[PDB]
Amino acid sequence: QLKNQIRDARKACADATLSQITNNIDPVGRIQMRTRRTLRGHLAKIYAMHWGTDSRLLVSASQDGKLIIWDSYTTNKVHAIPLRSSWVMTCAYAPSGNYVACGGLDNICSIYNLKTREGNVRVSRELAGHTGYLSCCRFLDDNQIVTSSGDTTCALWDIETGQQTTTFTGHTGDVMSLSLAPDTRLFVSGACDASAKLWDVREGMCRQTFTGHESDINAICFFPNGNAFATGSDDATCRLFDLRADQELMTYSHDNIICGITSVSFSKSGRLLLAGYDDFNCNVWDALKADRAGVLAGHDNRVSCLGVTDDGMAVATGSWDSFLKIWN
Amino acid sequence: TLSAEDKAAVERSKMIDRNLREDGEKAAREVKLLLLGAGESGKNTIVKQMKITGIVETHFTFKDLHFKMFDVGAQRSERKKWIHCFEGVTAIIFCVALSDYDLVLNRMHASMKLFDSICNNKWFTDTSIILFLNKKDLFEEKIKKSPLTICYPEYAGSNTYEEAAAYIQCQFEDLNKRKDTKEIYTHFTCSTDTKNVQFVFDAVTDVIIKNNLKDCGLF
Amino acid sequence: QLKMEANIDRIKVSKAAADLMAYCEAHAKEDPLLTPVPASENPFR
Amino acid sequence: YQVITSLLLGTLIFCAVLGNACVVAAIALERSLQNVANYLIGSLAVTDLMVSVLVLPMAALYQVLNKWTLGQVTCDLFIALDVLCCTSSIWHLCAIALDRYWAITDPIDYVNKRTPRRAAALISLTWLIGFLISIPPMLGWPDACTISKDHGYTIYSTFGAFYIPLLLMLVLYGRIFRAARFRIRKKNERNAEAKRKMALARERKTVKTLGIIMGTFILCWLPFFIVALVLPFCESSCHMPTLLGAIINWLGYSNSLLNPVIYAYFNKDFQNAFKKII
Ligand SMILES: C/C=C\C/C=C\C/C=C/C/C=C/CCCC(=O)O[C@H](COC(=O)CCCCCCCCCCCCC)COP(=O)(O)O[C@H]1[C@H](O)[C@@H](O)[C@H](OP(=O)(O)O)[C@@H](O)[C@H]1O
Ligand SMILES: O=C1CCc2ccc(OCCCCN3CCN(c4cccc(Cl)c4Cl)CC3)cc2N1
Ligand SMILES: CC(C)CCC[C@@H](C)[C@H]1CC[C@H]2[C@@H]3CC=C4C[C@@H](O)CC[C@]4(C)[C@H]3CC[C@]12C
Ligand SMILES: CC(C)CCC[C@@H](C)[C@H]1CC[C@H]2[C@@H]3CC=C4C[C@@H](O)CC[C@]4(C)[C@H]3CC[C@]12C
Ligand SMILES: CC(C)CCC[C@@H](C)[C@H]1CC[C@H]2[C@@H]3CC=C4C[C@@H](O)CC[C@]4(C)[C@H]3CC[C@]12C
């Protein structure tokens, strides 16, 4: 009854879709991009990456067990951290840049300190307690961190104490994605249940639920305005859900594309969206016209991660071929 | 052209790259194995035999060859979301408990289903599988009490171990649909600890030799 | 859990779409990806 | 008449250069093709490219004009370059056979002690043998110019350039064939029949590959070396025709372009890389 009531409420407010209003909006056209920098050095497939707030330094995690930080301006490797576990699938970069978190199949995503009196990297904190593989743990502040695990639960931990301050439960399937809003007050999550959940950090109870996907959700990313987000699944369709309308706006799909998706990102203005498909390619779609606007080739294996800088100067895409390509 | 700070950063990056290359070259000289099977198949027994909260890594050396074995059974989750990380392993050691043929989790059926799922996975098309059958003595003691028909209604035969073990091995080896690409090795675990290690070493050597022959175009 | 989810404010999607367009056009002039940037100020050159 | 021969020689040289350059570029640019096994193939391709662009055109010009019009010192340089390049190309086959035998028969060494330094050492050894064979005739010492016909020098060149590497290659490939056979041989009736059929197919494929590899090299090089060994020892029977000599020489030179086809164009990963390029 309650679910039927919610469905009726969300359906009754849909008479005009944004896609038809976007017809009057002029198309963005073809955005031709070329590889500006080619970061190399990984000897195994990479699984995740993050962009710094200064839009100059980036960090990546790969299967060989090395966490590498590159200076995108000069390609030089700044820091290389040897990891205890080589099965890492995620990494994160603190907004202040003092700490770096990384994890994987092991139930701990360790946080390392980059600012030490000895001038060398060292382990700062190990967050044990999860009973499943950690999909991704993202920094919330210099002392708080949000972690998404494969045990269908999320956890907010205090770095100084090492104990999870908050626990989020309710997902039936394992949560494979997690994105943080610019306000750092509420976050979206995506699981294999073909649905997404909007949570808020402070009170720690379920704020909203979105559905519509037909397969496991692998990627998620907040809209720059913070009132919307995008999700991707194995159904080769990108779905944009906004927190205030509580309904789907458009579906990005094409006949040519049939493989799944791995990463979703937004530009600085949010006009265009970037997706990384398993067919060793990236697709740049228009977030408004819902049509394809660009194709980024140049990867010899499945694309695993990609990310835009804070200032939007360039976008760096990684893949299983152990090479990172910077496009502007 | 380049300032002092830029030059120092260039040398630091070069040193880091050289160290990373050396570490990768050192790590590339190890044979990686992936362990799979049901929890009640006596995995720990063979683990402690060869070795003497998620991924369990076991490192051991034998006849100048180093083996790193990754056990994933310690955690339960969706297999199709992290198994691709194990692509490229030299071999998959599968564990099966014969004595669980008449235990309802049906345990033998679940083991066969898991073996079918793993063997025919697209990520392990070229990955060899080494099958181990654990607890043969207790199976011999149990088979004197119940026939094979409690688990295999469509099977008729004698209740002798020499035939029952062969039938189980044939049934397990008949599940693969890519016999040309991959071969399955079956061994019976015994009290002698060195026998399992020798069988694993022989299987790994055979797999390496077959891969080399395929690369040379002979096999 | 679902009992209290329905007790939220419900508005029209047209104003949300208008807000999305307004946010998109407001920052369109400050998007390096949207409009190609020359080498005069491009740091990746 | 000379026009047809010149055109055919130019076409052969052009095809050889194209093949060698394509193999070299594909090996150099690709990342998945950088390994110890492929380094020897790359060195062989570079050597054959050097033969095609440095030795083949001048020999073709000599054949077309039927006489040397470039000078005695030019002929000496041509002989030195041709001997060195041919010896290096021949010894590349022996080095590749030795590497394959070591990899197949010693898996522990393949896993642990196999490094590109081994391939570099093999290439350096082949070049050293080529130099030690090419230097002595000039170190110790008009319209038609030929290699010195000293019996001792001829015996040394033939033995250290073709016969010894041929014997080593034959022994290594026989051991490889024995090992491959040992590995291959080592309701249910249908499964047994399928296993026997697969074993027979693998045996046939191995036999075909070994036969092709041996026969190409044999037909390319053996008759020329037999002729070069027999001619100086019988001055009273040097009535052999020029046509047969030209045919033998060009058949021997065709090994330079035939080697990449057998060793590079027949690999599944190499043609996959070629398709990736297009
Ligand atoms: C007894 C009765 C009578 C019978 C006896 C007499 C007649 C006998 C004839 C028997 C046939 C002989 C030739 C066999 C041809 C053949 O079978 O090839 C088939 C089609 O592929 C191509 O042809 C690919 C060919 C394309 C190669 C490129 C050519 C064009 C390049 C031009 C160069 C210049 C370009 C710029 C199938 O291919 P294949 O099974 O033969 O391929 C194998 C290859 O032969 C092995 O050598 C190779 O081993 P390796 O190279 O040594 O490492 C194996 O890995 C495998 O690749
Ligand atoms: O009357 C004619 C007509 C036709 C003609 C065409 C070309 C020509 O160029 C000379 C090239 C010879 C072939 N080289 C000889 C050197 N050779 C080698 C290499 C290592 C060891 C050893 Cl022992 C040897 Cl021989 C490799 C193959 C001369 C003539 N003469
Ligand atoms: C310069 C070029 C034209 C020389 C080419 C020679 C080739 C085509 C000839 C020479 C000797 C021949 C091989 C001799 C021996 C065998 C072994 C047999 O079990 C299968 C065929 C096979 C493999 C023959 C196939 C074709 C063969 C390889
Ligand atoms: C088929 C390919 C791959 C290998 C074999 C090439 C053979 C068949 C071809 C290539 C070049 C040809 C030779 C080119 C030049 C001459 C010199 C002339 O005065 C007589 C014929 C002769 C000797 C030709 C005969 C046949 C030849 C040797
Ligand atoms: C300038 C460029 C286009 C030169 C192209 C050269 C390469 C790419 C060409 C020349 C001959 C071609 C090959 C000839 C024979 C075969 C065997 C067939 O069963 C699969 C394709 C394959 C393997 C072809 C693929 C591409 C190929 C290797």
> D touches which chains (3+ CB pairs under 8 A)?
A, B
- DSSP symbol at A302: -
3 state SS of B84 = helix
3 state SS of D84 = helix
- Are the CB atoms for B123 and B88 separated by under 8 Å? no
- Are the CB atoms for A139 and A187 separated by under 8 Å? no
CA angle A328/B6/B10 to nearest 5° reads 85
Structural element, H or E, at residue B67: strand B65-71
The C-alpha atoms of residue A141 and residue A307 are separated, in whole angstroms, by 20
Nearest to B82 among A43, A74, A133 (CB): A133
The structure's method of determination equals: cryo-EM
Owning domain of residue D275 = 1-278
Q: Please answer yes or no on whether B179 and D194 come within 8 Å at the CB atom.
A: yes
Beta-carbon contacts of residue B149 (< 8 Å; ≥ 6 apart): B155, B156
DSSP-derived secondary structure for A58-92: EEEEETTSEEEEEETTT--EEEEEE-S-S-EEEEE
Q: Please answer yes or no on whether C33 and A227 come within 8 Å at the CB atom.
A: no
Per the structure, the count of domains in chain D is 1
Ligand 2 near D63 CB (within 6 A): yes
The C-alpha atoms of residue A234 and residue A257 are separated, in whole angstroms, by 11
Nearest residue to D257 (alpha-carbon basis) of D7, D22, D5: D22
Resolution (A): 3.1
Ligand 4 near D243 CB (within 6 A): yes
Collect all residues of chain D within an 8 Å Cβ-Cβ radius of residue B205. 107-108
The C-alpha atoms of residue D128 and residue D140 are separated, in whole angstroms, by 18
D215 among annotated binding-site residues: yes
- Are the CB atoms for A248 and A258 separated by under 8 Å? no
Test site for ligand 2: of D47, D63, D162, most ligand atoms within 8 A of the Cβ: D63
From atom 15 of ligand 1, which residue's Cα is the shortest distance away? Answer: D266
| Count of CB atoms situated within 10 Å of the CB of B104 | 7
Side chain identity at residue D154, one-letter code: T
Owning domain of residue C29 = 1-45
Ordered domains of chain B (ranges, CATH) = 30-216 (3.40.50.300)
CA A175 to chain B, closest CA, distance in angstroms equals: 11
CA angle D273/D274/D278 to nearest 5° reads 115
Question: Strands A248-252, A261-266: parallel, antiparallel or unpaired by DSSP?
Answer: unpaired
The C-alpha atoms of residue A231 and residue A238 are separated, in whole angstroms, by 6
Nearest residue to A74 (alpha-carbon basis) of B24, B1, C31: B1
Backbone angles phi, psi at B207, to 5 degrees: -65, -45
Per the structure, the count of domains in chain C is 1
The C-alpha atoms of residue B218 and residue D173 are separated, in whole angstroms, by 11
Residues on chain D bordering chain B, Cβ-to-Cβ distance under 8 angstroms: 37, 100, 103-104, 107-108, 110-112, 176, 179-180, 183-184, 188, 191, 194-195, 198, 202, 205-206, 209-210, 266-267
- Are the CB atoms for D33 and D45 separated by under 8 Å? no
